[PDB]
Design an enzyme around this catalytic site. Structure first.
Site, PDB file in Angstrom:
ATOM      1  N   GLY A   1       0.794  -1.216   0.000  1.00 12.28           N
ATOM      2  CA  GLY A   1       0.000   0.000   0.000  1.00 12.28           C
ATOM      3  C   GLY A   1       0.828   1.268   0.000  1.00 12.28           C
TER       4      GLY A   1
ATOM      5  CG  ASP B   1       9.706  -4.173   8.289  1.00 15.68           C
ATOM      6  OD1 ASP B   1       9.810  -2.927   8.337  1.00 15.68           O
ATOM      7  OD2 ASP B   1       8.887  -4.774   7.554  1.00 15.68           O
TER       8      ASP B   1
ATOM      9  CG  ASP C   1      -0.237   2.791   9.599  1.00 15.16           C
ATOM     10  OD1 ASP C   1      -0.712   2.094  10.519  1.00 15.16           O
ATOM     11  OD2 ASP C   1      -0.351   2.521   8.390  1.00 15.16           O
TER      12      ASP C   1
END
Ligand SMILES: CN1CCCCN2c3ccncc3Oc3ccc(cc32)OCCOCC1
Length: 274
Positions: free
Chosen positions: A17, A97, A136
């Site tokens: 996204g 991450d 987010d």
């Protein structure tokens, strides 16, 4: 014209996204960059740069937060293509991450999760002072500079400029969404960021997110699957308070017993990230 020459494009780091991110090297300084391609059609939040030019929100936000050393991956450049926007962001190396990190390493020792949470808070706090809300805060949007132990925020595509008024829009995953977004589809920047910080701290000390359905979020009751210090449990259950007003400020988070004796990122890299 300057994009494909200034930067050497490499493997695709990730796609989703956020668009498509590629590993890149700035030929100028052989500097590791991330090249983020964002198709205009898929861009929801547009804004105007102070220069007087229409750009993606992420560009506006990053330019506001990328002035100075921050726990935020800085926007080094950006280019407008015909049907695409290209952002040149920092690429730490080596890097992982926080999501991949947790999924691999399981739940995080509270010493590591403490270093990491504090760094995230300093970053969210820098964003707030720059008048930026990320909206987010999640494990996928935190990179880990592994040699330096430095957490770095990414993906401001779902963020906005800090407003003391109510936000009526959210583009984060329903599990990270505050209960007030779920019930009212209204929330306030700081308090919802604190909510996501509670979700993030739970994820860190527990390996998984505390709530997977709306019903568990609305309920706001938090159960721990790992041994988590009574103090850390209090911090999480405070950040995850159902009422945003009962939620802690960033000062109140950082002045909390569990947030004490935080290891500097270098120390945390030696003790935990080899
Ligand atoms: C599966 N993951 C995520 C890859 C895309 C993340 N990506 C971004 C995504 C959205 N907005 C900004 C981004 O900036 C970045 C800066 C450096 C990066 C990656 C990004 O290299 C680290 C590799 O991360 C681990 C791979």
């Amino acid at each position: 014209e300057p994009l494909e020459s200034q930067y050497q494009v490499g493997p695709l780091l990730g796609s989703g996204g956020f668009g498509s991110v590629y590993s890149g090297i700035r030929v100028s300084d052989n500097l590791p960059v991330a090249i983020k391609h964002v198709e205009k059609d898929r861009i929801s939040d547009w804004g105007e740069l102070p220069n007087g030019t229409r750009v993606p929100m992420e560009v506006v936000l990053l330019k506001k937060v990328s002035s100075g050393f921050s726990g935020v991956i800085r926007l080094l450049d950006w280019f407008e293509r015909p049907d695409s926007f290209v952002l040149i962001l920092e690429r730490p190396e080596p890097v992982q991450d926080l999501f991949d990190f947790i999924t691999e390493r399981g739940a995080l020792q509270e010493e590591l999760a403490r270093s990491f949470f504090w760094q995230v808070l300093e970053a969210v706090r820098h964003c707030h002072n720059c008048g930026v809300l990320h909206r987010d805060i999640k494990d996928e949007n935190i990179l880990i500079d592994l040699n330096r132990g430095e957490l770095k925020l990414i993906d401001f595509g779902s963020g906005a400029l800090l407003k003391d008024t109510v936000y009526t829009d959210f583009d984060g995953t329903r599990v990270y969404s505050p209960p007030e977004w779920i019930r009212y589809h209204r929330y306030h920047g700081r308090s919802a960021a604190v909510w996501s910080l509670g979700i993030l701290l739970y994820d860190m000390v527990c390996g998984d997110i505390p709530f997977e359905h709306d019903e568990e979020i609305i309920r706001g009751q938090v159960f721990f699957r790992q041994r988590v210090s009574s103090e850390c449990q209090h911090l999480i259950r405070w950040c995850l308070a159902l009422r945003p007003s009962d939620r802690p400020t960033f000062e109140e988070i950082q002045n909390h017993p569990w947030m004490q004796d935080v290891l500097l990122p270098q120390e945390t890299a030696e003790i935990h990230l080899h």
